[PDB]
Amino acid sequence: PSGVEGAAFQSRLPHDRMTSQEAACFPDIISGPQQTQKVFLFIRNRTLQLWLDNPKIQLTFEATLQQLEAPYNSDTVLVHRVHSYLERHGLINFGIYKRIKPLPTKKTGKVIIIGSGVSGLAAARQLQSFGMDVTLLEARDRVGGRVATFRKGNYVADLGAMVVTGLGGNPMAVVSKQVNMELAKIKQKCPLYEANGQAVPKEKDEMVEQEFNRLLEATSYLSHQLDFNVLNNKPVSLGQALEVVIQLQEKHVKDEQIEHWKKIVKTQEELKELLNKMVNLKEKIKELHQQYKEASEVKPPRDITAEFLVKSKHRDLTALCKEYDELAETQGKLEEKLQELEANPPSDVYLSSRDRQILDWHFANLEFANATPLSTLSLKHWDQDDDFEFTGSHLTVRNGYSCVPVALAEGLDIKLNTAVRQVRYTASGCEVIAVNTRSTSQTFIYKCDAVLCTLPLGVLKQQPPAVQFVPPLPEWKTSAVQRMGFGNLNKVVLCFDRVFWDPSVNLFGHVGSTTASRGELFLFWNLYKAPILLALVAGEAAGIMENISDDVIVGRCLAILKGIFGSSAVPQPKETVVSRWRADPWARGSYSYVAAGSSGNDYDLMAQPITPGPSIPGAPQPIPRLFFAGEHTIRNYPATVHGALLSGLREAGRIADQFLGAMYTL
Amino acid sequence: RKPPKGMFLSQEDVEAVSANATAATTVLRQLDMELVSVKRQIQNIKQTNSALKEKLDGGIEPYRLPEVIQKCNARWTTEEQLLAVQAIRKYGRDFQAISDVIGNKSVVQVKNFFVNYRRRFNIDEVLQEWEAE
Ligand SMILES: COC(=O)c1cccc([C@@H]2C[C@@H](O)N3c4cc(C)c(C)cc4N(C[C@H](O)[C@H](O)[C@H](O)COP(=O)(O)OP(=O)(O)OC[C@H]4O[C@@H](n5cnc6c(N)ncnc65)[C@H](O)[C@@H]4O)C4=NC(=O)NC(=O)[C@@]423)c1
Known about the structure:
With 666 residues, chain A is of the alpha+beta class. Helices cover 43% and strands 14% of the residues of chain A.
């Protein structure tokens, strides 16, 4: 899409239609005549365009109104009112841009932000941009959260986020223009290799894959067309549904061999009953011929009864012979339409053990995608976010994805090695109690008007709590925290002194021996300039490989690599790193997933801010003081960097709306 | 509205595989045993029918008789008249057999014979005795 309509698309907005967001700020426009709506819609898209076309400088309201043309620029309050909407909700002037008007000398309000992951930093950027006083508290000794980038010599490898899922409507597209990022397209081709060490032949590779996709489509049919979504009071998972689908295909192979062999027995019996009748006919012929012979022995000249007896037996014998010849014709057909059936048997198996193992790899790929075993994904909702997929090739960041957090952090007040232990929120303000990770006795108190919490969902889940809320979070919030899923996947970074793999292939698979280890070292990435291979640990494997030492893990990688390229080809790695995200106490996992029994509507519960009770009974209801952001708070883009970033932009909007008021709603 | 093609997913089927924990493994074991059940019933009749198939070795070639190429004639000699009356006593109204017995009389003339010599050969009682068997 191109033009002003392209800017609406690249901003995840319908170009010809006002959103629920915009109805809330412009209820005059959307309740009004169809014509003002199109004027508004053009002003939005035009301003979106102007920003997108050059996101390295601030887009001021003056600069906007100048490039606008009549009759669209006739009304300035509408243009000022649209531009301010866009700026507030981070649709324009977000990220890293030169500021035309430098920030105000005095700040209004003070916000404490917990965590400097990408969601934390993006809000911090916006809030500081809006003239607020902002401090971030980070438990780690580095920004980025789950954007971690290993660096040593020329060796650069992401241990966390690795891919940009397509620039079609992706806010990271804007950020990539702003920060020097080497965005390198992946090449989709992925050769599988069985545990023996040899490629799956192309013909086999396509019928398992297409069955895999056929099996997914099947589960969707059970979900939406058969309402197969509860089972002994429990919600049905995706893994359950795949089993039930495979079983029913196994069933149907058996029902259909039974039906085919049942055909053969019916035909053989027809022929049994027919050979019986031809044996019996051959013996009536046997004695009736005898009888005619003995009647020809009486020599002529005979009395007419004795001549009748010859003529009679002869007619009778031919009649039986005619009847026996008809059965031989019929017999031939039945013997021929029996070689046809026995020659067209239906398939003996639904999937062979080799076939089923290759499919297990495609399941390990889903387990990697959602970072959890398919037995935990909600059948009904696990893919509830597919409609918002971006367009275009997936890419990698060949200079390391940490370059983005590090860039966002430039300019902000970040206290590193600062672990929050308690959050206290009252009708009159908030205080956050943190300690020093290096020496825990040292204690810090931070007072503020609002706390933005970007604690990973796994941290929020921790029993007993790593962070205590005073007063405790309400049941509606804590239940969303139990119900949701927080998954796990890990990486092994392999650092070599020479390329020994196909350099024109970015990724290649390794088929597992068992179902139970389908995720154990199942995939390898050739992503970087230097010779680094990178090996995924998905599914149930992820949780279990965390209890095994690095050398045991690197050893199994070397064995698999030796199998694919020969023992001589694979040298010992110069450097090795193995992630352990579930063990990490500032993650407690990798990213979130729609658990069976959860829904995308828990993600909205995660995002509602908390409003404390009044200090004095009878005092008027207070302002909200506790705000949540991060990957698990954005329904339409969970578990990604872009989704984290979008949620930081989102809270900064609603915090500023709350503590600086929003003039653009009049 | 409908599954992918070849996928077999009926409502009646999905209960039957979910009803309990191993209700999947049971009903796929009833088909494996229902399939062995039929495959040896195959070999059993495939082997009964091998025995019957061998009692017919040689067919009926030895018991066959040569064809009689005989030009059909019109006039009724006493010998053919006598043969006729006897065939009627053995075949009732099956004119084709009677035409094959005499060998020189067409089915019509056999039928015609039924009327021309109906009185003189007492065909009424001849046919009435045929029916007494
Ligand atoms: C349906 O679609 C898909 O599922 C999807 C689609 C496409 C791609 C991807 C992939 C999967 C993977 O291949 N990759 C990836 C890999 C790994 C291993 C991991 C781990 C993550 C990814 N992410 C996710 C991305 O990493 C994150 O979701 C994002 O980073 C979230 O950030 P955040 O919410 O801000 O949070 P934080 O945790 O970063 O920050 C919190 C801060 O709190 C600090 N603190 C904690 N406790 C305290 C305390 N007590 N006191 C003070 N500070 C504290 C902590 O120290 C930290 O500083 C991927 N996303 C991608 O897009 N690309 C990828 O490449 C992908 C998946």
